[PDB]
Structure 1
Amino acid sequence: TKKDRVNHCLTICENIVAQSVRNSPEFQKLLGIAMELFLLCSDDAESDVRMVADECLNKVIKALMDSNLPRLQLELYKEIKKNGAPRSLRAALWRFAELAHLVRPQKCRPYLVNLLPCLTRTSKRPEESVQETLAAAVPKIMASFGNFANDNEIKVL
């Protein structure tokens, strides 16, 4: 049934964006649980649950980019590292490729080293939907991180 999941998503979404403090550790615990909730709902059989969780990811990202990118991008990476179902993987992949230009020079080297194993796993997959998302993601990820690579890391890619 769509109604239970739609109402749960929209409730968690509205609770997180309406909260003004945006900086406590308990808010970051709740935020991780919401990124897990919406990226799970991105894979649901019911099309309304997918559409709502996509709108909730886009809302909660744009509501928090001034305050919590260093956890929004961590949870999107924690989904790409799992190598899961096509929809939840894609729902993290294209979002992480948008947010890649906002990452600090202080963290580009860590994120590249952590993403090379993900990029060389997601490249193996038979799904043309995942491969067409990866074709949009690589040009944006490498424009953000490609100066932080060693020559051997480029060759492995």
Structure 2
Amino acid sequence: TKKDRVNHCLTICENIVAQSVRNSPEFQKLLGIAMELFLLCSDDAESDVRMVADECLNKVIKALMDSNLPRLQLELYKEIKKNGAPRSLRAALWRFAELAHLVRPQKCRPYLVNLLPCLTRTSKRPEESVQETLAAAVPKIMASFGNFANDNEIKVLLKAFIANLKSSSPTIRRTAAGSAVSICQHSRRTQYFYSWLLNVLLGLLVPVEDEHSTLLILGVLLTL
């Protein structure tokens, strides 16, 4: 059913846009169920299946950025907390940084608290492909969800990424460095959080005539 699996994903897409009926108590139930089903089409391992049905999920969103944005972004936060496959969790993470500057500031503060449990688990993941796209979303997420957090929530998040400077992969060393520095542009106080990252790193190289674990010497010079 490898050619039978291709025709199933594509017919669900066109019969939502051609409804021309939104915000209906019949239309609300239909969009939750078959939206998680667009990514199982990408989770199945075939390049004829993985390439075809990922461009089809983008037809739904952009025709619905006007009409149903609060219905779109509620099904999508659920999958990160599911913490699924490294192919399933990845291509959902493109979708969520581009819709971060589409939220309203009325509903934004509930969206901030729920992500910091979800944004630390994908920092502890050793998959070198999952760690890459997060260095292209923590630029985009915490610049629009930046100003809504206090001084309590943002001190927890930066102690985690420095423990991702203690890994030996060259792909994972440069994605934890561009995450610490994109927050401090948008944290709450842009100048208060620049002085705080310089105290943490120089105790990692406090007096230089020591053994400093030469993989960890390279973690401190890329955040700078």
TM-score normalised over the length of structure 1: 0.94
After superposition, what is the alpha-carbon deviation per residue over 1:67-97, rounded to whole angstroms, capped at 9, x for unaligned? 1111211111111111110121112111011
The separation in 1 between residues aligned to 2:25 and 2:86, in whole angstroms, is 31
Q: Secondary structure at the match of 1:128?
A: coil
2:17 maps to 1:35 = no
After superposition, what is the alpha-carbon deviation per residue over 1:54-74, rounded to whole angstroms, capped at 9, x for unaligned? 112100001111111112111
After superposition, what is the alpha-carbon deviation per residue over 1:7-56, rounded to whole angstroms, capped at 9, x for unaligned? 11111011112111122132222111221110222211122222232112
Moved more, 96-105 or 2-11: 2-11
Structure with greater contact order relative to length (CA < 8 Å, sep ≥ 6):
1
CA RMSD of aligned residues (A): 1.9
Identity of aligned residues (%): 100
Segments of 4+ moved more than 3 angstroms: none
Q: Secondary structure at the match of 1:139?
A: coil
Moved more, 48-57 or 104-113: 48-57
Structure 1 runs not aligned, ≥5 long: none
CA distance 1:48–1:26, change in 2 (3 Å):
farther
Moved more, 22-31 or 146-155: 22-31
The separation in 2 between residues aligned to 1:79 and 1:103, in whole angstroms, is 18
Q: Map 1:54-73; keep pairs closer than 5 Å.
A: 54-73=54-73
1:76–1:93 contact (8 Å) kept in structure 2: no
Larger radius of gyration between Structure 1 and Structure 2: 2
After superposition, what is the alpha-carbon deviation per residue over 1:118-149, rounded to whole angstroms, capped at 9, x for unaligned? 10111100111110011101111101111011
Q: Secondary structure at the match of 1:146?
A: coil
After superposition, what is the alpha-carbon deviation per residue over 1:96-122, rounded to whole angstroms, capped at 9, x for unaligned? 111100000011111110111110111
Q: Secondary structure at the match of 1:95?
A: coil
Moved more, 6-15 or 33-42: 33-42
The structure in which a higher percent of residues are helix is 1
The separation in 2 between residues aligned to 1:57 and 1:104, in whole angstroms, is 23
Q: Give the corresponding residue for 1:150.
A: 150
TM-score normalised over the length of structure 2: 0.67
Q: Give the corresponding residue for 1:10.
A: 10
Q: Give the corresponding residue for 1:119.
A: 119
